[model samples]
Target: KIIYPNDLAKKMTKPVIIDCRPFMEYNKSHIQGAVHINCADKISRRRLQQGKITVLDLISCREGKDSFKRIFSKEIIVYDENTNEPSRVMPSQPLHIVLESLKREGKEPLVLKGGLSSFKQNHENLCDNSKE
Candidate 1:
């Protein structure tokens, strides 16, 4: 269920990488070919603008809606912030929520070991695949 940065680098074929971070952070940098998922809606922004935050749950996310069907069985990896341990993440977090969603939609999905923050520190070469 856990795949290290080093381990991922060795793959012969590209695996499906699911990123659950917000656009601001994700746009800055991310591993090659990573896909970002945002479940928050415009309503959340209105709520936030009014000085209140919304708690989103898995039900808000609809998996089969626009997702590519081929992705269901491929080697998949998911990450968020610096989620190193599954137990460490709260049930409400995007990564945690994504992992739970994957339980039904995926087949033995791999978690990015130690998340993206740790990956940046350890694998500086091609950090953005930009270390060239």
Candidate 2:
């Protein structure tokens, strides 16, 4: 599933927002309530779990350890640098991997359309930076 920035903004129950871009950029500023998750590493991502990434991989991450199992609903939303188009399924992209993992796990996750750039461009008030 995919969601527009405006739709996300108006959502009454905020979802689990996962940002798959580099952490440095995340620290600079990211969508509010977004957690940075690196689904794959420098090596081939298939090495992690039977040639497939899973939601378990992300939940176990130190960056998202606590966030993954919080008071949020099952509405997980993921985004990255430019994972804007659904048809442009770049499996190598971190956002795509995360979305795949979620779908594989039988969960319905929404891809934030236009990613960080568009969201930040339109909803600056809904973006935030790290404390340190």
Candidate 3:
């Protein structure tokens, strides 16, 4: 679940960007317009719905792990910031669990190429994809 920074993601009027990381990690730093979705919380699932979002932008702290599993199983662009360096994102956590569940339910998802840290460092100039 990882993809390159896309042009549509830049032009989107109001894309849905989900920050699939713990609140603490997110609060420390995240993509400009990403929403912190605690992967373990069911209520936050509503944040995944398609509505005002003209496009879907999903991001996780690390790819190929829990957050990757959670947000990729949908019509969304997934990203993980930890791709610049090889690392682990704890595949057994809620994010992975949710993602696998969604997949079993027939949802194939995607992710960013280099995750958050990489994105912030490289794509920061791409259209202010932040909420603030």
Best by lDDT: 2
Candidate 2 lDDT by residue in tens digits, 1-132: 889988888872346778888778888988877777654454535543344545645554544546545623457888877677866877667777776667677678888888878887768888886687
lDDT (Cα, tens digit) per residue for candidate 1, span 53-131: 3222222243455445445536778877688877677876777656666664435667887888887776655335333
Model 1 lDDT vs. the true structure? Answer: 0.63
In model 2, the runs with Cα more than 4 Å from the true position are: 12-14, 43-53, 60-73, 130-132
Model 1 residue runs over 4 Å out of place are 12-14, 42-69, 124-132
Model 2 TM-score is 0.74
Model 3 lDDT tens row, 1-132: 545555424534334355555676676676666655555445544343322111222344434456545654436543444542213446644345334434554555455556676666546554243254
Clashing pairs in 2: none
Model 3 regions lying over 4 Å from their true place: 6-15, 40-74, 83-90, 125-132
lDDT ranking, high to low: 2, 1, 3
TM-score of 3: 0.50
lDDT of 1 at 110: 77
Better of 1 and 3 by TM-score: 1
Give lDDT per model, in order: 0.63, 0.71, 0.48
